[PDB]
């Protein structure tokens, strides 16, 4: 008693929108450092009938029978998990039940601290993530700062982790869980020094891996798995899985941390798995231990080395003046122009990319940067060579927005009228979508 | 950079469990009452590129740009949300992001009451959800009885709400927040008395339609949005959508509710939204509101009618004596069985039920029944008709079930010791296979 009908004839009306969404990602240079595209096979994964089966509990302590495939699959994505960030089933357990990134560090956080506990993390503003505590004068704007009392330490000038202002901060206020491991932060981080801030206050090292999950995986960034009592990721971003996440958790460094972190995510935040997206994490982690995706890996980083040193030839200041990793931040006060400006000004071109705070930036308000990434375009095709004509790209971009700027007034609103119909932008958009729709697409 | 080969090649060994998976389905009379079979446009939808997409914030408030045909899904799914469920978008908005049911209602939650906020609901041991407020003497099991402070209300001995136990709570608890709408309730709501006990202690009305989604939205049952400030609904239930849920709030009767609730899924809980879950909602949302879907949703509760007529016919006891709606719940005592039993028996014949306590259960140690719901078998083409098979398959478990308690023993351990290679569940299971394999299937 049901419609079998295809979503080209059943809604013609979404078919159409999600089409020309299909396009615009065809058509884009997509810098976006926490977006990529996922093969076909996980999305089969992802449609599988999968997701009508409740399976809420564990493998082989479920609250309902039926549950034999599905207890394969969890038991399955999690070896696979274990193994491709290279660690031992006995001295480490993996969570894959976490709808996405930020639930997990939630669930991950309370599992050690409990409601009312202490809690470290970088500012949202220095490149921390909304999860590791975020709040604002005005309001407590994570459930993060909420649930848990959280302080914010921060980068210095030259964006660097500061640690001897986390150490100092640590000692005064005496929290359960330091979070490393960020969302903008071009440069790899010193777990071993932040372990040791940890022990000397007794707290938990807690590292989100979600940006750098790959690097961490394939052995070519430092290696949190040495000294985290916790280590979170995302599948989503370089990982290049569905939208997921994973918890890990030391067992042989912490006993009873396993009940912990299990009960945390179900039952005190979750209800049912969503089994579909625990298949297709499977079917990514298969392949994130292959040869073939640390060559991918190792591509994504050429092609950030090449785009940074690119721009610093074009005299375009980068924050830290490079990167270890797949992502830059760029510095834009040289050419007096918003990271929000250039926004707008590379959504009219076809570029994704996304302001973000530098650190001269006293607060979120006027973020004088933006970020970009390359890990999908890397998964689109293109080599260091391909490098050139992004930062090629940005810098006409900077430079229309200077253009513009000087045109139409400092003002966001009176910028932007600017936009439409502008005869550079037109120009340059069709190169965009030349270059763009002629990349391979999964 | 990227392998597209499909799931069958690139990993065989997940394909053949998730094939095994789908075979089981087929094979199943499935009665849990909180499953469904989605159709292959609900599916097409979760496999779509459109998660690839970052789209923190709403439409028009993105952080990100290139998010217009997001933003035109997103618009879409609220509207068809907002039509589906019979109200106008100048009196109420929805949130279409949460995850799943226990997110949304915690999202929900938090944005009435804040962090140590007062909250009532129905006991899990009666028929309330986790996210209710559920806690043991052990342990503060659901983080809605850790970071609220909750009390938690009893059906009486007839399984009904008990309204005056209710009231008597209300008044000497004082909660910001009464929570109704259940997860094994056989019966429809009285919301009218729900909100005159709200409007007497000052406390917001919060509904819960997760299991009886679809009777609301078709006007069958009692509808929440004339008495509630909230109403929370899965949308993989008997709505059949894919798994993920809905926050509906009444701006109307609270101004400003808009933003707390809007504020508390993002970025207080989640960070980006699913966009491929927020895209199958919107194609399920669309078929709801046809009148094809309500004769769908009238099946569901006549064939609900006629199994609890047909297992009233064979000598068996249901909590309530009936159901108003798509569940039953059957009391097990007579015949000295337990809910545990007889889920492991039906388990051996391809049956899924679960357990589920009954009124004169005092713990959730030794459940004294089952659940059991029509959607599913609904959405597979059986009719009234066919209801007395089923009734007669779940009896003769029943009578099996007993005979290997009588030869094994009372111990579970024992119990199960009978199960394997038994003569009569074995003939039994072929037949319910050679029936349910038959079966429509999407
Ligand atoms: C969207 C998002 N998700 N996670 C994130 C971010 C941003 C970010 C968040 C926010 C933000 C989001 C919700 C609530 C408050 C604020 C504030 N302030 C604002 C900005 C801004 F700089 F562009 F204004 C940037 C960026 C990657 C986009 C961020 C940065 N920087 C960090 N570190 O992490
Ligand atoms: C799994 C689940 N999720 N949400 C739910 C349930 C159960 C339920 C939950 C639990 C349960 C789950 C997690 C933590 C503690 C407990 C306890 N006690 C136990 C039982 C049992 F009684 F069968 F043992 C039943 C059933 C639909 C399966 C339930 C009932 N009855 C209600 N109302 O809601
Ligand atoms: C370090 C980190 N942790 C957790 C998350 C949460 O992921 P979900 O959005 O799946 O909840 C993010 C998202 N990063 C946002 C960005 O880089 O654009 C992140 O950067
Ligand atoms: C009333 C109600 N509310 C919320 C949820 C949570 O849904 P998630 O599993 O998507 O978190 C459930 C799940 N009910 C489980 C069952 O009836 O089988 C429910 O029954
Ligand atoms: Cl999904």
Redesign the pocket.
């Known amino acids: 008693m049901f419609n079998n009908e295809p979503l080209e004839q059943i809604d013609k009306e979404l078919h159409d929108i999600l089409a020309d969404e299909e396009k615009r990602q065809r058509e884009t240079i997509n810098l976006i450092?926490?977006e990529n595209l996922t093969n076909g096979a996980v999305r089969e994964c992802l449609g599988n009938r999968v997701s009508n089966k409740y399976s809420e509990g564990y493998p082989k302590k479920r609250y309902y029978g039926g549950n034999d495939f599905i207890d394969k699959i969890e038991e399955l994505c999690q070896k696979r998990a274990l193994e491709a960030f290279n660690v031992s089933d006995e001295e480490w357990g993996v969570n894959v039940q976490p709808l996405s990134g930020s639930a997990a560090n939630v669930q991950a956080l309370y599992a050690l601290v409990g409601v009312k506990g202490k809690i470290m993390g970088m500012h949202?503003?220095?490149?921390?993530?909304?999860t590791h505590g975020?709040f604002?004068e005005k309001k407590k704007?994570?459930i993060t700062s909420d649930m848990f009392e959280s302080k914010l330490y921060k980068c210095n000038s030259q964006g660097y982790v500061d640690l001897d202002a986390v150490r100092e901060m640590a000692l005064s206020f005496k929290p359960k869980v330091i979070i490393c491991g960020?969302?903008?932060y071009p440069r790899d981080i010193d777990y071993q020094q932040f372990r040791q801030i940890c022990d000397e206050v007794n707290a938990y090292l807690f590292a989100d891996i979600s940006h750098i999950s790959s690097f961490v995986a394939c052995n070519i960034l430092n290696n949190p798995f040495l000294h985290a009592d916790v280590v979170t990721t995302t599948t989503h971003k370089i990982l290049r899985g569905p939208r997921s996440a994973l918890i890990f958790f030391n067992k042989k460094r912490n006993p009873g941390i396993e009940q912990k972190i299990n009960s945390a995510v179900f039952p005190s935040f979750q209800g049912g798995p969503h089994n579909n997206k625990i298949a297709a994490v499977a079917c990514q982690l298969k392949e994130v231990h292959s040869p073939a995706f640390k060559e991918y890996t190792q591509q994504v980083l050429l092609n950030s080395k090449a785009l940074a040193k690119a721009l610093i030839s074009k005299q375009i200041d980068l924050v830290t003046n490079g990167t270890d990793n797949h992502l830059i931040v760029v510095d834009l006060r040289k050419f007096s122009i918003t990271?929000?400006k250039l926004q707008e000004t590379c959504n009219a071109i076809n570029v994704s990319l996304?302001?973000?705070?530098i650190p001269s930036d006293v607060?979120?308000?006027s973020?004088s940067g933006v970020?970009i990434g390359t890990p999908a375009m890397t998964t689109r095709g293109a080599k260091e060579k391909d490098m050139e004509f992004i930062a090629d790209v940005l810098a006409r971009a900077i430079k229309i927005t200077v253009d513009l700027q000087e045109q139409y007034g400092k003002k966001l609103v009176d910028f932007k009228k600017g936009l439409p119909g502008n005869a550079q932008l037109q120009q340059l958009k069709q190169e965009v979508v030349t270059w763009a729709g002629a990349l391979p697409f999964p």
Not at 124 to 130: A, M, Y
């Open positions: 450092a926490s949202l503003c220095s490149g921390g993530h909304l975020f604002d704007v994570s960020y969302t903008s990271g929000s996304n302001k973000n705070t607060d979120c308000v973020p970020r």
